[PDB]
Amino acid sequence: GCKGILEMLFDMPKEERPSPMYDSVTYDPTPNTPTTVGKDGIWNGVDYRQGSTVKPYCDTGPVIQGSSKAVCVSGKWVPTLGVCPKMCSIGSLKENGKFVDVTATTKGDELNPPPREQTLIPIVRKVDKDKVQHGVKVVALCKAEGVQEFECDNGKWKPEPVPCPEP
Amino acid sequence: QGTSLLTQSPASLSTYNDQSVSFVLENGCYVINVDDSGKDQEQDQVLLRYYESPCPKKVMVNMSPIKDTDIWLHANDKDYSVELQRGDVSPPEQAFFVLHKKSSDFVSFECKNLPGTYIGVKDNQLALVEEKDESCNNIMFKLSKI
Ligand SMILES: [Cl-]
């Protein structure tokens, strides 16, 4: 068996955990797994069944610096799971580039669709429309040909903005 | 039916009147306290484990303090109380409550084996209560991120 992803994380001090934290973690049973919880289930109260598949979800974007899914093999999750990325700030880009407008061109659920299991329990979350998920693309304006494209990469906009000329 | 997927998420657990459900070491073991002193609620988060179960449709939810994810809330029918139990003794299948969604993102937890009996609040502690014998808000809790 394998210790669960969140159990591993909450065994270490808060300063040693990745930030941000996974929003949810879903475990897929092998075809031979009879029950969801039990001595032969996905979870037996101590650890998680061998061959189970794990898929973390981050509301900040698709995971970075590792794999999006892993399998329980020999007490370890292989390959190494990715961690949650940081979001980027629309207002920060508008300010650093002196842009007149910044509009998102993709939604976070395109690259990072929420699992169905996230609707099972209402967990209250802070909403901040100024933040966009990792991997979301935007377009900024200068107010001819003054249109620049940007991508959110783990809290940083790519590429660096060419600040608009003084009107 | 196929085997239902199992999901886990951290959350902060609070009551209807916005009191923290916290965990404190008492004589060596963790107890559950309903606190309204304003202390930081980060260390007192819970680890939720939940899955769908076909009902003749039901969301089953299990709850552990992040301070010790090897123990979880459990309904004691021999004392009519809410306690923490460790997985080397108590079976995990008996450790899931039936989630009921209420208004304004509040939820309630019904005992799987004691229909109509819910997790409630009595004297700054969690207890088992009868839905009809209580007001709505007595069994209403809120799960919040961070
Ligand atoms: Cl233990």
Residue numbers in the entry:
A (entry chain B): 64 to 206, 214 to 237
B (entry chain A): 111 to 166, 177 to 266
Provide text from the study.
Interleukin-33 (IL-33) belongs to the IL-1 cytokine family and is an inducer of host allergic and inflammatory responses. The model gastrointestinal nematode Heligmosomoides polygyrus bakeri secretes the Alarmin Release Inhibitor HpARI2, an effector protein that suppresses protective immune responses and asthma in its host by inhibiting IL-33 signalling. HpARI2 is composed of three CCP domains, with CCP1 implicated in DNA binding, while CCP2 and CCP3 are implicated in IL-33 binding. A large loop which emerges from CCP3 directly contacts IL-33 and structural comparison shows that this overlaps with the binding site on IL-33 for its receptor, ST2, preventing formation of a signalling complex.
While crystals containing full-length HpARI2 did not form, crystals were obtained containing the HpARI2_CCP2/3:IL-33 complex and we determined the structure to 2.1 Å. The asymmetric unit of the crystal contained one copy of each of HpARI2_CCP2/3 and mIL-33. The structure of HpARI2_CCP2/3 revealed that the two CCP domains, which are joined by a 3 residue-long linker, are not flexibly associated but instead interact with a buried surface area of 522 Å2. IL-33 interacts with both CCP domains of HpARI2_CCP2/3 with a total buried surface area of 1548 Å2. Most of the interaction occurs between the CCP2 domain and the rim of the mIL-33 β-barrel, with a total buried surface area of 1040 Å2 and with contacts involving the edges of β-sheets and interacting side chains. The β-sheet contacts are mediated by main chain hydrogen bonds between CCP2-β1 and β1 of IL-33, which extends the CCP2 domain β-sheet.
